[PDB]
């Protein structure tokens, strides 16, 4: 029981995992076991979803979050997102589960039975947190692996089946991407776009060509950077800029992951390209716009001249102008005039929504889709009662977009707290005062008074 | 082969339960480290074989 | 639904997802067994 | 005295509390108060 008590390690049980900071073998076991946990959940949850899946009903009516991910990749679905074959879902679940068993075996071995420290057994796998060269070598290895993952996505899109394209001409379909966007102007203009309304930063990516080109660039950049960090060691300015310790590296990663969690929240809330509404349900903006469209259709069928219908406030009841003049839906949904979706874009012309097209060319499938999205807006209670808070019990529905956005905002925030905690502690421990103030050398006592 | 496949899968499940209990106990029991090592190796091999046998037979039942 | 061949295991699949939470609890059971030393 | 280990006592008692609370949530979805 080496270092497995507070007396010998300095750490209490509630901080026990800090006892592993300098025990590389047991720490490797811990990480492999936790990765086994991740893979195991993927497999078990996917199998649970499949066992509870009703193929006829939309995915988003059934509390599914993983099957939509598989379907977006082009597996198991056909035109309009209809499910034609669930065996790909089942295969994903089974394979992840078996792999989880293997990972668990490896992690338990490295954590319980294998060498406690790897430095003596091997210098390739052993490391010292303060060895900047070795640290950057491991970082580069994992960068190469990640780049390979991005290129795997590219391969799925280009050579093995393609991806589900909600924008495909005909009403959404699996499509093979053959002309990925390699234009750096486009790819990095995305990064330079403002995050505010009508711009959306990277969350605004609205076509699979741009998606695939972006991931090509990510894979190549990651491979090059990993080779760089294998072959180099940090320069002097970096050495003087950073804290070089295990806790500091953990803190940096906590900050990065928090940022990624917030970004994912926005991605799933706003983007209907890589999160097709056929699978994840309408976005909030989409559902609001859909209500506007639905009642425009109903009243126009009754005989209203929607272009000229004046609302109570003087603004158009069904149609008005955005602050830059585009014709848009009226009512509160004026805030959502940046929304774009395949069921709506056929009605849009150069100046915005086109009155002639609204009058003459709205199709039954558009009417049906608008009704569906309006009635599956992402609003619901914690006990999964669909609709506004004042609605009565009857509909058992909370949108996958709501579940995913809320969960990952919670995770991103707590990981920001983690960044702050571990970064502050890393600084204090590197400087040597993380256990408190030295009584005989209290820094403030040697400073001049403020007044 | 329906019942045969079900039996093979049930054997996989039971063997997984046995391994899940036994591997950590053996690892944390340094005294039992002569017979238990062979047991663990044989169980790992048989578990892999059963996983393959299922999967192969999945396409012969349904 | 699962493929027909696997229907007999449906109750097991129904419970598999919570095992990670069980692991978190197991950590506390173990520490209790060692007295939180 | 200490015939039955306290960690066993704590684990079993926690399992019992968990079972009771879980049954209460099951009731939330069944029988009276289920909205159905």
């Amino acid at each position: 029981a080496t270092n497995r008590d507070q007396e010998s390690s300095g750490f209490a049980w509630w901080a026990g995992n800090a006892r592993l900071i300098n025990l590389s073998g047991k720490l490797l076991g811990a990480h492999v076991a936790h990765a086994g946990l991740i893979v195991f959940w993927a497999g078990a949850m996917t199998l649970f979803e499949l066992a509870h899946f009703i193929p006829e009903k939309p995915m988003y009516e059934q509390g599914l979050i993983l099957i939509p991910h598989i379907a977006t990749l082009g597996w198991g679905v056909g035109p309009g997102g209809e499910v034609v074959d669930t065996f790909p879902f089942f295969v994903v679940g089974v394979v992840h589960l078996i792999s989880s068993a293997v990972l668990g075996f490896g992690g338990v071995y490295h954590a319980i039975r294998g060498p406690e420290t790897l430095e003596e057994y091997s210098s390739f796998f052993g490391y010292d947190w303060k060895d900047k060269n070795k640290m950057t070598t491991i970082l580069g290895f994992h960068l190469i692996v990640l780049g390979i993952g991005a290129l795997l996505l590219v391969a799925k899109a280009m050579f093995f089946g393609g991806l589900y394209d909600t924008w495909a001409p005909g009403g959404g379909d699996v499509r093979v991407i053959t002309n990925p966007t390699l234009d750096p102007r486009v790819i990095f203009g995305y990064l330079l776009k403002s995050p505010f309304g009508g711009e959306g930063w990277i969350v605004s990516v609205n076509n699979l060509e741009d998606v695939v080109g972006g991931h090509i660039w990510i894979g190549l950049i990651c491979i090059a950077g990993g080779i760089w960090h294998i072959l180099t060691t940090p320069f002097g300015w970096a050495r003087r800029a950073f804290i070089w310790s295990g806790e500091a590296y953990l803190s940096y990663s906590l900050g990065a992951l928090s940022m990624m969690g917030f970004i994912a929240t926005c991605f799933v809330w706003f983007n209907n390209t890589v999160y097709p509404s056929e699978f994840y349900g309408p976005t909030g903006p989409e559902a609001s716009q859909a209500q506007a469209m639905t009642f425009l259709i109903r009243d126009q069928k009754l005989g209203a001249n929607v272009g000229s219908a004046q609302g109570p406030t003087g603004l158009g009841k069904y149609l008005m102008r955005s602050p830059t003049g585009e014709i848009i839906f009226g009512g509160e949904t004026m805030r959502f005039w940046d929304f774009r979706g395949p069921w709506l874009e056929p009605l849009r012309g150069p100046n915005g929504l086109d009155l002639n097209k609204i009058k003459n060319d709205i199709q039954p499938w558009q009417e049906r889709r608008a009704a569906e999205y309006m009635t599956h807006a992402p609003l619901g209670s914690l006990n999964s009662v669909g609709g506004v808070a004042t609605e009565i019990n009857s509909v058992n529905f909370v949108s996958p977009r709501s579940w995913l956005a809320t969960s990952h905002f919670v995770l991103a925030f707590f990981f920001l707290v983690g960044h702050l905690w571990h970064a502050g502690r890393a600084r204090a421990a590197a400087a040597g005062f993380e256990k408190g103030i030295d009584r005989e050398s209290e820094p403030v006592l040697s400073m001049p008074s403020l007044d | 082969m329906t019942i045969l496949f079900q039996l093979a899968l049930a054997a996989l499940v039971i063997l997984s339960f046995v391994m899940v209990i036994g591997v950590p106990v053996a690892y944390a029991s340094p005294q039992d480290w002569d017979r238990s090592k062979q047991l663990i190796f044989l169980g790992s091999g048989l578990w892999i074989a059963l996983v393959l046998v299922v999967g192969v037979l999945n396409f012969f039942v349904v | 639904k699962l493929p027909e061949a696997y229907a007999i295991f449906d109750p097991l699949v129904d419970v598999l997802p919570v095992i990670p939470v069980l692991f978190l609890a197991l950590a506390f059971v173990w520490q209790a067994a060692v007295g939180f030393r | 005295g200490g015939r039955i280990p306290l960690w066993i006592v704590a684990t079993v008692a926690g399992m019992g509390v968990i079972v009771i609370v879980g049954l209460f949530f099951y009731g939330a979805y069944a029988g009276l108060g289920s909205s159905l």
């Binding site: 029981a1 319980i112 | 339960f17 899940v20 209990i21 950590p24 106990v25 944390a28 029991s29 340094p30 005294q31 039992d32 | 109750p11 097991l12 129904d14 419970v15 919570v18 095992i19 069980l22 692991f23 609890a25 197991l26 059971v29 173990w30 067994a33 060692v34 | 280990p5 960690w7 066993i8 684990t11 399992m15």
Partner: peptide, 27 residues
């Protein structure tokens, strides 16, 4: 069925701990 399966999955862990305690294992 589900109750029995979960009972087994849930006795397993404390079972490992109990065996290692009875066996003077490296807990």
């Amino acid at each position: 069925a589900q109750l029995t399966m979960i009972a087994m999955i849930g006795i397993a862990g404390p079972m490992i701990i109990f065996l290692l305690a009875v066996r003077r294992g490296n807990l």
